[PDB]
């Protein structure tokens, strides 16, 4: 035992690797697919369930299901499939010899992390393991100790403020609007063009349309009006069956749901008011260094022109005398894993594991103690 | 028991052999002939009914009847004659010792296959037997597991799409236009030349004219116009009684019924639109590998220039960005039997038989379970 | 030009008249007779060939030949004689001034109608002409637009179904059994009584025996058994030379060939199964109004008791829930000409002619276009 | 101008009448039929296309096509024929003098309603017109202001929840399974009995079989097992040509597609889970009054025993502490038109029209404003 696995199971995409590297060696969608047709050939009981990209490669004949929804593991039997796939089929590593570092979102149910720990100890028998917080690990990546991290992933969007080492948990804001809810809204606003995507396979096509043609408009009604002369903004996409679709003002209406959650019928505030309300709940003296450090993480923060709209629209809320600075690293998509590969290689951390025997005498509630 | 019989009873031509060989050892027309004149000699009660080629050799004095029409066995007493002829007079094999593999078309009546099984168990007492699907066995021949098989035989034309082992039965398209309906249309369009074929014996002469002089025009009205200078296209045929007939633009009008079913007063679509409508009913992601694998089977797919017209006329329907590939093996006429000789020699299949005793306790509905 | 000639050249009897009248003014047998003995008087080169009733009046010294057989003109030089006789010697009309309306049977050779048109334009130089279909004109007579017409003439028997104006050409059934084949069978079954008719002159005597003493038995074996007490059914006929013949059960065996074509060694179905198979080839919704309209035409449908046997024996085939109605007009013998005298006097038809000049620039294939 | 036309063009059946009455004075199938045979009579260019019941009366010779599919008008030239037929040939009304009230399904393409408005103003020049939502008008009929309307018609099935006047558009669920897809599945499961319906005319026969012999089984496998003793459940139907067919367990397998969309190879949920998922997407406090008001509309909700299965199978999903009440009015088949005849006679609505001049200065996008 000299190296430690770092496994970030996001709600839509698993990223696993070794502690020490600057990039995960395994990045694959956290999907489990079951065949839904007959299978007339002789490969009948052959691969009764697929995981990873075989779930995505053969997705034309499968029902795809995500075991994680809103950062909460809803299907515990598929999560074991995905973990078994990561350890054995993707990293090619015996879990017996390496401590593992998992991550999860704040304000999750207590039973989620407990069952995580129980599975990791009593099924993979890892020597040690540690469950970190996804918004703390995004500061380890940026080499900071101060900032308010807005981590918008695939299931959950959370703002976490952190002063010089100290987190203020009474100002952590969680919101259940993320990338999957934008995929769902794009699937719905595309019907008014005539395109109908219903299957779970075509959901993965709309996700790819979104990751390629969607951007965040710096001003919404202004772009909505310049979309009336609907040729300077329409992009065309090529479906897998050769058909081409022409998406116009849906390119910025889909990510506007981040700033107008009323589009999908949610009574909440945008990610710009949730991050402002989180700074205004912190102490009056740290309030100035949180404006100057707005670290963004997760894939849903990779829309072209999201850091400019955040910077423009928080400045409209904050007092006009000090500066707002949105720090968007170019690799923020993996910014949670990088931090995990950092925290796990620090010598000062080598004593903050949870050892198998320590888990024995203390029970599955031992994981709740670890700095909460 | 070490070898298994493979008996493909098409609607117009029986092909039987042993599982393991690469060609059937028995290929004969599935006809039953009854004498229709007096018989003044002493061979009066001698061979009151003929089957096979004696039905075809002595066809000048017989009424010929096909027991199968449109893949449906309409005369159950003649089918037993044909089976008894295949087992005893053609393969020279006691059915008691060999399991048999029959085939039938999709979307047939349920009673057809049930009565098949009942006859094969309670009259020939085969040890085991299995009823496969004719469009799945055409992929076993081509060594594929993906493709849309267009199997045009003598009574039925069906498109069946099959992704990587899995069939999509909601897109199977059956059409009751096949080789016999083209023989009938050629018998009718030949009257405008003056030639009148009416008897069931002369039907078998028009079938031979069709199998020798008929082709599929790559463009219909273009060839129909180049047939006005009616000497560069007219072929002559020699009847059995020495007379010669001169067939001209009937050489491509007869197989055009496959692409224009309105010629025989049918409100349907050609085999090019039925195969396109079958791919467009499949899932959007498998839709690309079905264009690149259009396996053709059956004798009615042996007209010179049918794979080029299919490839040319599906490309006019599919999106212009990906390739259409019609895979026409040179022995596709037996492509359903070869597959049966393959599936029956696989060890993984040796447990998918239906044993006589298994048929006893379960009843004749046991055959409907077998992967449907 | 104000009136149009209507010339129906049947295969055995020409009926010509003027469009507008309700009966043809010229009805004569379509026979050409050549003298076959020496002619010792001085009228040597006097009338080297006879046509019409002089062919029939002087038939004791002539070889009689029909130029039309099975609705197909086999002797093109005698058909010109018959047409020249109709126009000049029977109607007494210059063809130059009147358009003509010819008729022919369905499913005839294409060259027949083309040569008809060529002769009528380049020999008689009619201004206009039109070639209609004999089974459509039988509905114009009955004032109907729906029904299945069974037109049994002297050479051909065809069933043609016609819904509300629209013909279904894929269900037209032609059969080459007609009145001449019944004359031939009566000539043969009369030998077992001892009477031998061989000459073409005595063929015209057997035809007259048939038209007077023959009927259709409502039940065949029943009448065949009541013919054993062979006095309640035997009728006597007086030959031209004063001899009397006694015909018994040949009175209903000759017309039974219409319902049992196996009598003359034909492998076909009766006129009752050919008309039932023609309705069952039509669409399922028009199938009900074709049972209720079975219009009969032609002379061969004038046997006493043929409409009752048709009505009785189709009812045995059709489902027992709806009614069969055989509509036998009392003048059906001319029912094809009446229709022609109707269609030719309709103003909506005056533009559907084929004008001499229109035939010039289009060629003899112009006549194939006319609603086929 | 004192009365207003109410024209509900469903995807399979047009219902038009006057605002104020309690029933439409015009109910006819929205079909356009083109003759597909020759037409040998003189009524050649006579009624080159039929609409309404002449499309259905003469359907034995026509190709029938629905201009609307899944609530989307696909053939804009036939929809004008159907509208011209409704106004002039069915209501006998000059459109110039009456405002009209059209309806359409939710989540349709934007261009559909725009082209509707454009045709109604620039072709029929109605003074005013209004396009309502089909699920709101079903509450006007029931005299309610609260409920979740499940409107299953011929092309589309939509759940729309409506609290006390306010609709929640983020929970509207549309599904493209409706009566036509059940007709298509019945056409397919009838082949295993031997009955083959292919034409568009026989599609209208299978629709009539479905509307008369089909019911919804309260428990599926239980009825499927009691269908093994297949005489206590088999009903016989009489085809138009007198033949009788015996339909057994297809009587409840066809409407089971509403609750098991996997039968036709759709990856969706039944109408019982789509209506439960729509209530669970609404706010937690209105959730109780939506269970107690499940208003059903459309013809596809007229199967015997559908309101009991819905009530039984939602109760299995909802919490067991409160009551589920399916409100199925006895005239729900017209429940969308009645509402239109109500909303159009309300004085508070007389100012919510779209006047011709108001459409002039605002363009065809004026219709999108009207409460969306
Ligand atoms: N380039 C991109 N532009 C917009 N959205 C993206 C992009 N890449 C990924 N996404 C969205 O981000 C999600 C993945 O983000 P990630 O942070 O990996 O989620 P998780 O934290 O659950 O692993 C995907 O669901 C996708 O919809
Ligand atoms: N060389 C050929 N060209 C065109 N048609 C052919 C040819 N050979 C056979 N056929 C047609 O194909 C039919 C036989 O096809 P096959 O696939 O053997 O039918 P089945 O599946 O019923 O056995 C015959 O009816 C014949 O009309
Ligand atoms: N009264 C009758 N009874 C039976 N057969 C008749 C009668 N009159 C004529 N025929 C037969 O019908 C034939 C004439 O029918 P017709 O319809 O005039 O023929 P075509 O259509 O060729 O003119 C004759 O050959 C004759 O044998
Ligand atoms: N009594 C019935 N039982 C079952 N289905 C019916 C019945 N009546 C009509 N239908 C089905 O409902 C459809 C008509 O429903 P309707 O609500 O009028 O459709 P639309 O909204 O398109 O007008 C028809 O296609 C028919 O298949
Ligand atoms: Mg994450
Ligand atoms: Mg075959
Ligand atoms: Mg005639
Ligand atoms: Mg409706």
User: What is the subunit arrangement here?
Assistant: homotetramer
Question: Class of the largest domain in chain A in CATH?
Answer: Alpha Beta
Number of domains of chain A: 4
N-C termini distance of chain A = 27 Å
Rg of chain A: 22 Å
Strand content of chain A: 15-25%
Biggest beta sheet summary of chain A: 6 strands, mixed
Function (chains A, B, C, D): Actins are highly conserved proteins that are involved in various types of cell motility and are ubiquitously expressed in all eukaryotic cells.
GO molecular function (chains A, B, C, D): ATP binding; hydrolase activity
Subcellular location (chains A, B, C, D): Cytoplasm, Cytoskeleton
Organism (chains A, B, C, D): Mus musculus
Structure commentary:
The structure is a homotetramer of 372-residue chains. Chain A is an alpha+beta fold and 372 residues long. The first copy, chain A, folds into four domains: 130 residues, ATPase, nucleotide binding domain (Nucleotidyltransferase, domain 5, 2-Layer Sandwich), CATH 3.30.420.40; 34 residues, Actin, Chain A, domain 2, CATH 2.30.36.70; 108 residues, 2-Layer Sandwich (Nucleotidyltransferase, domain 5); 86 residues, Alpha-Beta Complex (Actin, Chain A, domain 4), CATH 3.90.640.10. Chain A has 13 helices and 18 strands. In chain A, strands 3-2-1-9-10-18 form a six-stranded mixed beta sheet, with helices on both faces. Chain A has a five-stranded mixed beta sheet with strand order 13-12-11-16-17. In chain A, strands 5-4-6 form a three-stranded antiparallel beta sheet. In chain A, helix 11 links the parallel strand 16 and strand 17. The longest helix of chain A is centred in the first third of the chain and has 15 residues. Chain A is flat and about 65 Å long. Bound molecules: adenosine-5'-diphosphate (ADP) (4 copies) and magnesium ion (4 copies).
